[PDB]
């Protein structure tokens, strides 16, 4: 719970910060809004190698924008 | 069973955010929510007996 306590302290400088956080979470969903999804890069998706070229296919075909990536290395 | 998109009728608190959530067509009874004791509707004791896809 203490990890997102920082959210409220950041909200002083940034008024938007609370509203934009809840739109990502999918609580305060307005009509023109988005949501977080998870596209797993399988053996078929290795066709694309870089994150820059992944940005092309997602943006051009289905109008999606990526925030980041979640890796699972063997170690 | 089919699903219908709609805002959930009973919000447990006042200042709550309404959203479309794939609601059930029929409003289910309180007995069918429980797994442990299979009531006169779908007598299943454990969760594996339901046969959950995904």
């Amino acid at each position: 719970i203490s990890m997102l306590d920082t959210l409220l302290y950041q909200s002083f400088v940034k008024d938007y910060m609370i509203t934009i956080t809840r739109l990502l979470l999918g609580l305060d969903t307005t009509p023109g809004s988005g949501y977080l999804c998870a596209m797993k890069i399988t053996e078929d998706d290795l066709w694309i190698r870089t994150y820059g070229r992944l940005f092309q296919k997602l943006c051009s075909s289905s109008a999606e924008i990526p925030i980041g990536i979640y890796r699972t290395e063997s170690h | 069973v089919e699903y219908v998109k709609g805002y959930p009728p009973n919000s447990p608190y006042i200042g709550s955010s309404p959203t479309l959530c794939h609601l059930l067509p029929e409003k289910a009874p309180f007995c069918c929510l429980r797994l442990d004791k299979g009531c006169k509707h779908n007598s299943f004791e454990d969760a594996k007996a339901y046969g959950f896809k995904n």
């Binding site: 307005t30 009509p31 | 805002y7």
Partner: peptide, 19 residues
């Protein structure tokens, strides 16, 4: 249902929610 239902809940004020 889709178009009319979404915009109605967004513009809905606090007094309209409580009613």
């Amino acid at each position: 249902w889709i178009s009319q239902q979404r915009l109605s809940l967004y513009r809905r004020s606090e007094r309209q929610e409580l009613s």
